[PDB]
Design a protein around this ligand. Structure first.
Ligand code: GDP
Ligand code: 21F
Ligand code: MG
Length: 166
């Protein structure tokens, strides 16, 4: 019934912007860290009503112990990098490994997300991202929190993965 999703990735790749676009249908330039721990949205996916619970980690995410808590909480994870930020892409494998270690489980439902597809000066090619995703055996989705391209697709794909195991 309820799916706990956690969006992960480097500082400034668009984690909050993607979540807010999914929940509020608006693009933000900025946001305040909030007392609320998550946003919840009812959606219908493949004919079934589902509740998406997406953690709002802004602020407290800087603490590793808190990230450990978020990872234990999450059922599925969006691995987000920014297509104009090579380092954010190169760090994806570290984040993936950390999640697997914390959850004490190989193969945790994940989707690779390349965000900011609307911006110029792409430094990560689509084929690069697809190759990485293929190596993990997970879907790759290009997104823009600004234009909303791929946003619903990214989160719904993640839900479909989680649904196969819980
Ligand atoms: N043009 C564009 N800007 C974005 C996109 N996603 C996020 N941003 C901007 O990038 C900055 C960092 O986004 P933010 O959500 O705070 O990154 P976070 O640290 O990963 O949560 C903000 O100024 C956003 O407005 C996108 O898809 N396109
Ligand atoms: C904008 C900088 S910050 O200090 O406020 N937040 C940083 C903290 C470190 N960081 C990551 O560890 C990125 N990966 C990641 C994010 C989250 I939220 C969770 Cl739950 C797990 C991971 O890695 C497993 C980037 C932003
Ligand atoms: Mg944020």
């Amino acid at each position: 019934t309820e799916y706990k999703l956690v969006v992960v990735g480097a500082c400034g790749v668009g984690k909050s912007a993607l979540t807010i676009q999914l929940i509020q249908n608006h693009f933000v330039d900025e946001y305040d860290p909030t007392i609320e721990d998550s946003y919840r949205k009812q959606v219908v996916i493949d004919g079934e009503t589902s509740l998406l619970d997406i953690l709002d980690t802004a602020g407290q995410e800087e603490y590793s112990a808190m990230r450990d808590q978020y990872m234990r909480t999450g059922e599925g994870f969006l691995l987000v990098f920014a297509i104009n930020n090579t380092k954010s892409f190169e760090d994806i494998h570290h984040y993936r490994e950390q999640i697997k270690r914390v959850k004490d489980s190989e193969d945790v439902p994940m989707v690779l997300v390349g965000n900011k597809s609307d911006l110029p000066s792409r430094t990560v090619d689509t084929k690069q991202a697809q190759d990485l995703a293929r190596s993990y055996g997970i879907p790759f989705i290009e997104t823009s929190a600004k234009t909303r391209q791929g946003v619903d697709d990214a989160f719904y794909t993640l839900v479909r993965e989680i649904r196969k195991h819980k």
